[PDB]
Amino acid sequence: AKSKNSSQHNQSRKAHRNGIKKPKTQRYPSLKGTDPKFRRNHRHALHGTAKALKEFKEGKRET
């Protein structure tokens, strides 16, 4: 026949049992969602600067 419908009696205790784990923050957050126009430019910018560092060895005064 009829029975109970809903409850939230033991949920808070069950959750706090072994902690509410907040995810760990990092140093370089991902670029998933940033605007594609900015993304295109950023890729080129890193490519160019990376070559300059290697060039700064055979060449000079790239600071």
């Binding site: 509410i20 784990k21 605007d35």
Partner: protein, 158 residues
């Protein structure tokens, strides 16, 4: 029993009393950069790019900037774990937050106190500390003499 996108938002999304009509234009002149600390507060008069009722009052970190909107990161609490949500909100609903402003003010004085003290030759005592109990002192009764009190009798007022 229903659950719509704006259920139970009768008093939250409303504008105030004697605050109707034109939106002050100084809102549209602020600028945002990634890493800024903003807080969400929705305006009822603008129906485009508005957030769900849960984020009305939360605080988050900008992670993206676009033509007329910013991307904010905030932390939601599902049962027994946290999740990070990424929402898109129009700048008409956002505002720069004064949560870290005290920290920035304090760090500047700390640097300059330390610099000045190193040149002079006295220790610093820079980090703050809670309110300690009071200290001893003396109170005079000259030209201030005590007045005697006493409880008052009962009487009906009506």
């Amino acid at each position: 029993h229903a659950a719509g996108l704006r259920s139970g938002t009768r008093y939250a999304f409303s504008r105030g009393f004697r605050k109707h009509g034109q939106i002050p234009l100084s809102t549209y002149l602020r600028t945002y950069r990634v890493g800024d600390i903003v807080d969400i507060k929705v305006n009822g008069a603008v129906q485009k790019g508005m957030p769900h009722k849960f984020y009305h009052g939360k605080t988050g970190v900008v992670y993206n900037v676009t033509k007329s909107a910013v991307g904010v990161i905030v932390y939601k609490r599902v049962k027994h774990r946290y999740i990070e949500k990424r929402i898109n909100v129009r700048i008409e609903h956002v505002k720069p937050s004064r949560s870290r402003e005290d920290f920035l003010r304090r760090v500047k004085e700390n640097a300059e106190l330390k610099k000045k003290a190193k040149a002079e030759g006295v220790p610093v005592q820079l980090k703050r500390q809670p309110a300690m109990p009071r200290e001893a002192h003396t109170v005079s009764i000259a030209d201030n003499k005590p007045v005697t009190l006493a409880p008052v009798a009962y009487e009906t007022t009506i």
